[PDB]
């Protein structure tokens, strides 16, 4: 699992 703030991709 890579670390991502989930802000500019569709995180849903």
């Amino acid at each position: 699992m890579v670390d991502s703030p989930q802000l500019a991709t569709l995180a849903d």
Partner: antibody
Amino acid sequence: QSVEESGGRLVTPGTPLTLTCTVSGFSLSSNAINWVRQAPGKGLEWIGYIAVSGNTYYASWAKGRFTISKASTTVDLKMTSPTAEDTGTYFCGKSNIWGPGTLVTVSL
Amino acid sequence: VLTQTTSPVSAAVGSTVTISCQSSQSVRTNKLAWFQQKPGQPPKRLIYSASTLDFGVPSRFSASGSGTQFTLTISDVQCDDAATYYCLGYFDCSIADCVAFGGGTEVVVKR
């Protein structure tokens, strides 16, 4: 689905205050959570986030002043040593999902 | 630093507005989003991945860009679009902050 912040209130400078983001309708195991804030009248400011792994990341200006952590259903934002500059609304969330915000006041 | 069109931008109902977002440092991948905020209310995302509309968002909204130039276009401006618009980008952590918001651009409805 949603999130909700709480714990904002008036405190004196230096009083280590913690805010809480409560997840509902989704999982912290598959989702990341961000803390954002806004001084009254000013613009939005990114503070930091916590990945699904548990790894925290912070804005340069926020390092030392702020600490994020997560339990099973909640994410905390510990303010280490608040000053009057820290007054504002604080929002938790990611992407689509943002709470109504909780209002922190720092003053004597 | 993400720098945005200087507030306010005023436009009449039915008109078009365009808001720029310029980065002093190139944005990661094409990981940029556009948010709308009305006073007292939390931010709502309009665009993610630079071009892609979120679910439930009016087709009046459009966006483009890459590297260090991004643009949000509001066609057929409605009274409903009176708000402040913020761009947000990803960057390499260990060169700069992972995430940054722009300064925000306020939209006024000409009347």
